[PDB]
Amino acid sequence: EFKTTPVDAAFVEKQKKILSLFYNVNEISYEAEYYKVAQDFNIEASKDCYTNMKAYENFMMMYKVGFLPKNLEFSIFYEKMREEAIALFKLFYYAKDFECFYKTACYARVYMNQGMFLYAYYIAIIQRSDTASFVLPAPYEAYPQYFVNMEVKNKMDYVKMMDGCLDEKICYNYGIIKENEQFVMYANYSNSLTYPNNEDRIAYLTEDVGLNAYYYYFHSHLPFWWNSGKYGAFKERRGEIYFFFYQQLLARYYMERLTNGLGKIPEFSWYSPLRTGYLPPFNSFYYPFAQRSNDYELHTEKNYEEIRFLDIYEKTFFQYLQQGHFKAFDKKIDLHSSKAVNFVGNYWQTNADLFEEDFLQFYQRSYEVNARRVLGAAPKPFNQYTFIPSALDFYQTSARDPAFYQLYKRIVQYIIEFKQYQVPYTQEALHFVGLKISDVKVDKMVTFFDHFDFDAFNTVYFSKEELKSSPHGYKVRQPRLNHKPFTVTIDIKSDVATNAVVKMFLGPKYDENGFPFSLEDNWMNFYELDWFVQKVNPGQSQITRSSTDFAFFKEDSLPMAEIYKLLDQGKIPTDMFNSSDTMPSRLMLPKGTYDGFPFQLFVFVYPYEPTPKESEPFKAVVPDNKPFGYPFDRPVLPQYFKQPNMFFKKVLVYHEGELFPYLFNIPHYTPD
């Protein structure tokens, strides 16, 4: 009951090579294969490992100067850095074949900044079409310092310096135990000291490792600085998925807020104090992460120039809308087409497609980068290779900061302002003639917390001796949200014999007040649970769909220990290779309440139009003509949403066992 895929022996060899660069990423083992291979890799004499001569020579130019030194923090949001990671990726991506890529990576694993190496390496593995099917470690196993609060990281460093536990009893009381000769450290989510306000209610979501990893995978599947020509016809839809990704994520987040009684995502101004502070429980080699207080004044001497830029970046968009048709980055933008939809997203992300070039150029300033800089609260960088980090400097920690959700809310509002220019769906575009949903039934929907382990060994240091055998076994254990399986049953009268699409969303039923949401105001608050095609036949029939089969959710990634165990059996975990960029399903449902929190499930059935065969960047691109998020991709006329083939069903989400995650990490106490 963990999805398997069989896999042959040539595969095992290549997968083992790729996985091996992730062992002890923070130090160098002189007797690892990678070290020998890098010693033996003559880079000057290797023009013929590369499909692209320019990339090679471009790398050598920067190479001869020198790169970002080992041990410094890496972030693509600083330019000098970005130009280097991009050079590294071009090398990885234009390597003739696998041998070539492996020597290049070994070299980089040895001689280059570990952050930069891991960033380029992940992206290249996802992007190279000969590596497309290989599995990667979960990002929290590759960069545990981005996923572990200081408290836990310190406890582990402490256990290491002592070479183990003084005595068991002392240790157990501090949440430190041995299991099968490995160390396990119980971890709480952070308290009122890092989230000095109500946002702490939600720390179990915002600090969730799955949810942070998801954002990282999203970025690495199509990074802003890269064009999307690798993906064919998807190029003309890149901006669409940008909106969708953020609209869905914020919809997921607002639902968490509702169950924890927290109301709307706050709005703000660049010219005003921002309310919800955040003190990141992280440090880099030199600096504690930058802290932002409650009521932090965004508008100060240090951010004035940035704020001017941000301000006119948004107001330009207003000017576009005001005008309908306008000259923008080559063509005339007409707001009534869908070349408009694409433009809108590329505009807000300042991605490579906006400029219709291959890679983001050195002088093109991004809206999102400057926003993160203002909101990150950090002091200005010490030099081009040394910045003071904040949660917003990385996709791995971004979702920990309340400001992150506020910033994307603002962008999503802006896009929704443009979406006011889109013609709404008519009766005839949504009516499925000859078919009616007569009823929807759902099993009990139940959430709970349960423990979850990962190996954090990459954040622990090891002697020359211990390294000779790839040492690990430093596990973090944490209560994480989860739900039970449940089945949706859909009942249908049908005249016709066609293939059909069934979509299901979850959205709010009541606002923070107690009033029924009205669709005109709530369509942006629905997130997709599922999509699939079904043969329908006339009469009454019924489709059953288990939550374990929902399209947009995955199983927890396996740890590397387990990946290797499986490899020795010719086995690969499906969800880790066929769909890493997908939301973990443990977070499928907001945390419920013991009585049951009211949400609603929208079930929509429409005719299926045979759409060709692609191989797009994400799981969110289903083989359909339909816009992403359809029929909730755009403003609603409510009288058109009483279609026989639509059905809004009230459902309560329960919760069972302890309502608070800390109750799982108390020494002489066991929960429920």
Place this chain on the structure above:
Amino acid sequence: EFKTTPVDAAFVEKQKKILSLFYNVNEISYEAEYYKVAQDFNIEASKDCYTNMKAYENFMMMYKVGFLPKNLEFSIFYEKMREEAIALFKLFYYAKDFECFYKTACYARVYMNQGMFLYAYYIAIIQRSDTASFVLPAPYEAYPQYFVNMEVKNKMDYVKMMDGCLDEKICYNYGIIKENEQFVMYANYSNSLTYPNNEDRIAYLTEDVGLNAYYYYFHSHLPFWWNSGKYGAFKERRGEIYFFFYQQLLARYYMERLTNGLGKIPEFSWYSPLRTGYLPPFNSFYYPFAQRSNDYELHTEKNYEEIRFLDIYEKTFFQYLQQGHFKAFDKKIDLHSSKAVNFVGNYWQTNADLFEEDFLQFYQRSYEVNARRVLGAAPKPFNQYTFIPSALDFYQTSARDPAFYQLYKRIVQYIIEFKQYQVPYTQEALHFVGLKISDVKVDKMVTFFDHFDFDAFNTVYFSKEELKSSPHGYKVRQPRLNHKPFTVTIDIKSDVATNAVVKMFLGPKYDENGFPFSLEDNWMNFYELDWFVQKVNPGQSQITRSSTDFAFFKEDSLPMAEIYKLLDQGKIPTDMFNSSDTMPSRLMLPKGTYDGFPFQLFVFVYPYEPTPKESEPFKAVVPDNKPFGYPFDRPVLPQYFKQPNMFFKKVLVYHEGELFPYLFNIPH
């Protein structure tokens, strides 16, 4: 459904006369008794109707000048108005006997500002020892303009102008119905258009008519501007009563917050914007009530002077705290005693007692009065008699404004700072030698909403013809919170045999965190449910105690129409008589969840010391020399609250039927 008291014939004659002044408060019936008696009343030639000659002549000087004109808004927070209300109260109170009192009242009811009359008349009935036992209409029946949202008031006004329903079925859809030839108007609590924020989650408590009446009652039972010497031995505890009242209230209010996901009462600063606005649906037929927007700057030009005042009034207090001991207002005060608690309360209320005088004087400025003027947001009064009203201008609307709880939270905190001077209770002062609570059991505690009617006839005008028949029958229907009765059973093992005091408190179990509250930071958050004396037996016994019997909660007021019918039978309602100044039962519990919301029940048993034989200003004054709120009148060391004669029980408060009151008011 209500407790009755048999009542003799003399009483009924007097009670009827009293209640008759509360009929059609807003116009005059040329054919009613009160009118003829008022006309026959030579105020000039009847000095001998009064105990106090000074009071008599004082009123006359004033009356020769002139009083607040009829129809204008009356508020005791404005100097000249207060001085006039006090003069009229002096008259009522010093009336030789009930006859002179009636005449004066008839006289006042005819020639005077009706609001000013009602204010003075209420208080007089409560204070005069020959009226001590008589009953009063609930505040919402006497001043329904202060308990009705504008939409409802207008629905009634237009029905009157129409002389009834044109068409039953349009009317129905607007929540207007005929019942026994009386009109019933259904009323919603106000929407985000009234509280443009989170505080609207709670409108069902803050707008609640019981809760607002309760506050009006607490004021009238002992007004800040008056002396407390009428209650003798109680005078030494007036400040203690003042603290306890607000502490309890805020504790109750915070519990409603917690069940609606709301957290701590925000703190504020006179020199910064106040986050939470208030827009009242009330008007004085002249000005609408002043609105306070969100993020309203307190420190603007028109408030410079008042903020200066409020600022030193506070800082003077800090200086007290810093100095430990000092002379103030005659006295030498040492913050280690209880002559201290009393002083501290009196200080904060600037009441008459703080000056050792009979009535507040013209020029002794009140912190609460200016706090309320600044927070109330109104432009400055136009003249002596004409201000722009705010919710904080009246005891009967105060509880409706978020700022009200913020203001009293501030005062109560300053008192808690003082309380750190008080020496904590020790093991020996709390331990009951030879007695132990072995268990506490509680019935299911269930809240719910159900309908409640009152007569709003007082804000409707009638013709000469109609008036001849003193007319009513304009009823408002509203969902109100409520709970099902429940029993607490306490199990006690004891060695010997004495009378015991049993006390029950309700506190939160967790903060907005989800984290257990510790007693150190929670003692202020317990509200008292009950107090009673018990004969304890040797060995094992069980005390059973029902909610319907809880000492600090009352049944609902009956409307006058019902009071009249009871009087016709020789009966009155006990609670309106014996305990009007007590909180209503239905509000005993905060709204629960279907779920069941986690709180704790604190059960205390201590030895009974037969003491005081008194004459009570409030029912909060129980015949015990212990402090009010004992053992939660002061900072706690959590390790002394483990005596066998204490039990903390987790209870869960459930809720049944509809969670939102508006679903109770939907048409077809």
